[PDB]
Design an enzyme around this catalytic site. Structure first.
Site, PDB file in Angstrom:
ATOM      1  CB  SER B   9      -0.949  -0.015   1.209  1.00 33.12           C
ATOM      2  OG  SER B   9      -1.580   1.234   1.380  1.00 33.12           O
TER       3      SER B   9
HETATM    4  C1  GTX Z   1      -8.438  -2.646  -2.206  1.00 30.00           C
HETATM    5  C2  GTX Z   1      -6.914  -2.575  -2.180  1.00 30.00           C
HETATM    6  C3  GTX Z   1      -6.368  -1.601  -3.229  1.00 30.00           C
HETATM    7  C4  GTX Z   1      -4.836  -1.655  -3.312  1.00 30.00           C
HETATM    8  C5  GTX Z   1      -4.143  -0.911  -2.171  1.00 30.00           C
HETATM    9  C6  GTX Z   1      -4.674   0.507  -1.952  1.00 30.00           C
HETATM   10  S1  GTX Z   1      -4.222   1.196  -0.336  1.00 30.00           S
HETATM   11  C7  GTX Z   1      -5.579   0.337   0.520  1.00 30.00           C
HETATM   12  C8  GTX Z   1      -6.784   1.256   0.701  1.00 30.00           C
HETATM   13  N1  GTX Z   1      -6.366   2.443   1.434  1.00 30.00           N
HETATM   14  C9  GTX Z   1      -7.075   3.582   1.360  1.00 30.00           C
HETATM   15  O1  GTX Z   1      -8.326   3.682   0.729  1.00 30.00           O
HETATM   16  C10 GTX Z   1      -6.527   4.815   2.044  1.00 30.00           C
HETATM   17  C11 GTX Z   1      -6.288   5.935   1.036  1.00 30.00           C
HETATM   18  C12 GTX Z   1      -6.156   7.285   1.749  1.00 30.00           C
HETATM   19  N2  GTX Z   1      -6.284   8.365   0.758  1.00 30.00           N
HETATM   20  C13 GTX Z   1      -4.813   7.367   2.434  1.00 30.00           C
HETATM   21  O2  GTX Z   1      -3.849   7.959   1.888  1.00 30.00           O
HETATM   22  O3  GTX Z   1      -4.643   6.845   3.562  1.00 30.00           O
HETATM   23  C14 GTX Z   1      -7.848   0.491   1.440  1.00 30.00           C
HETATM   24  O4  GTX Z   1      -7.680   0.350   2.819  1.00 30.00           O
HETATM   25  N3  GTX Z   1      -8.865  -0.020   0.727  1.00 30.00           N
HETATM   26  C15 GTX Z   1      -9.967  -0.743   1.351  1.00 30.00           C
HETATM   27  C16 GTX Z   1     -11.150   0.144   1.675  1.00 30.00           C
HETATM   28  O5  GTX Z   1     -11.066   1.398   1.644  1.00 30.00           O
HETATM   29  O6  GTX Z   1     -12.243  -0.387   1.977  1.00 30.00           O
END
Ligand code: GTX
Ligand code: GTX
Lengths: 216, 218
Positions: B9
């Site tokens: 991530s």
């Molecule tokens: C689905 C995985 C995609 C690949 C990795 C992306 S980072 C994971 C994602 N994280 C976020 O949405 C946080 C983004 C936020 N803008 C930040 O910078 O903290 C998550 O927890 N997603 C799950 C959710 O929001 O429900």
């Protein structure tokens, strides 16, 4: 202080409410995106990201991203009224962190998902029916906000509206004019009606939102 | 301080670099999203937005959004070293505004457009080709960044990397592992290599970005 804007634009309205809050008079420079005013060199020279709102201060410092402008307005121009700056942008790192998270939530989730759902319907191709998936995603964002507002008067907590409220108010007024039934989210509707009643410059918020409403 | 995360991530990696910069140890708690671990009732109770990174501090204060965490880490945990905090997050409102703009640019434009272009290709349905319009939009974001970096060492200006550099470094390492040829954007490539060679936690960033490459084996 020059202010490159459109009334329909939620991020522009957020800045207008914040400027009113700190007593900054904006020199309004209506920037017609449909005409292509933002791609003229005088705007591009100021802002290579060619986006509104764009603020140009007394010294010619150029700033964009509404939420960055909001912070700048409080920090620099709101400073003179210390209790006011503290209400709009609390300085305690924990309280401020919540304000920051709500600002990022607004740009990246609440407004973003609004745009991904509605822009295809009202702009460009103007699709007759919104995508069921983008709708569910947008509703999930409203549900998040509803949860944030459970047992809270304001979006980031506290006893007074912060810049996070002003930002999200600009966003939620755009949901309203889009014809989304906000009453489905009881905390959001309650927060929206109450904050609209008390926040200075919320008139411009509703008025400009009505301009965006003309797309629907 | 508990840190709910995955190495792949980008926003988690931005926090990792920032924590390293301020000398804060994170108690790492792998949170498998594909497994629904972020949807467990105890997690939703900490963070109803069910996303990573999530930080739980010493008093049980819970925070998410990586860039809000970055700022919190500097203000509360980095500020004991006045010089260090000033470098990472300059206090002059004008200088800070540029840092803030770049952080918002990262979340809403740079990373957002990366996600919109690549996520359909690597998640769910897995479309064999990316959308041309989404590719053009992503290239535009890289172009914006490249322009920001013209004649400048760091994303928000200044003589030292800021939290904006750290956030955008996490994002750009993800571009890199996706197989985007960053040499197309000379200032971005130059800044990427240089900053990766100097910032705390860059080891976590590159190692974690490599892990995210697990989605791009085809
Ligand atoms: C689905 C995985 C995609 C690949 C990795 C992306 S980072 C994971 C994602 N994280 C976020 O949405 C946080 C983004 C936020 N803008 C930040 O910078 O903290 C998550 O927890 N997603 C799950 C959710 O929001 O429900
Ligand atoms: C009157 C209704 C028209 C639709 C209003 C959308 S806001 C206009 C848009 N501005 C933005 O997306 C700025 C977003 C930024 N996150 C902010 O909050 O300032 C823009 O300048 N877009 C042009 C560009 O980026 O090139």
């Amino acid at each position: 202080m020059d202010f490159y804007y459109l009334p329909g634009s939620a991020p522009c309205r957020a800045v207008q409410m914040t400027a009113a809050a700190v007593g900054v008079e904006l020199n309004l420079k209506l920037t017609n995106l449909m005409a292509g005013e933002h791609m003229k060199p005088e705007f591009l020279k100021l802002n290579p990201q060619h986006c509104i709102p764009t603020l140009v201060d007394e010294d010619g410092f150029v700033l964009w991203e509404s939420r960055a402008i909001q912070i700048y307005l409080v920090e620099k121009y709101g400073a003179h009224d210390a209790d006011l700056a503290e209400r709009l942008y609390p300085s305690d790192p924990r309280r401020r962190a919540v304000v920051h998270q709500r600002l990022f939530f607004d740009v990246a989730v609440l407004y973003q998902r609004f745009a991904e759902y509605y822009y295809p319907q009202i702009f460009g191709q103007k699709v007759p029916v919104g995508d069921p998936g983008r709708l569910r995603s947008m509703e999930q964002a409203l549900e998040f906000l509803n949860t944030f507002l459970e047992g809270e008067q304001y979006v980031a907590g506290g006893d007074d509206p912060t810049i996070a409220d002003l930002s999200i108010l600009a966003t939620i007024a755009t949901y309203e004019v889009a014809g989304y039934d906000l009453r489905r989210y009881e905390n959001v509707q309650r927060w929206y009606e109450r904050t609209s009643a008390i926040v200075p410059g919320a008139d411009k918020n509703v008025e400009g939102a009505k301009v965006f409403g003309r797309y629907f």
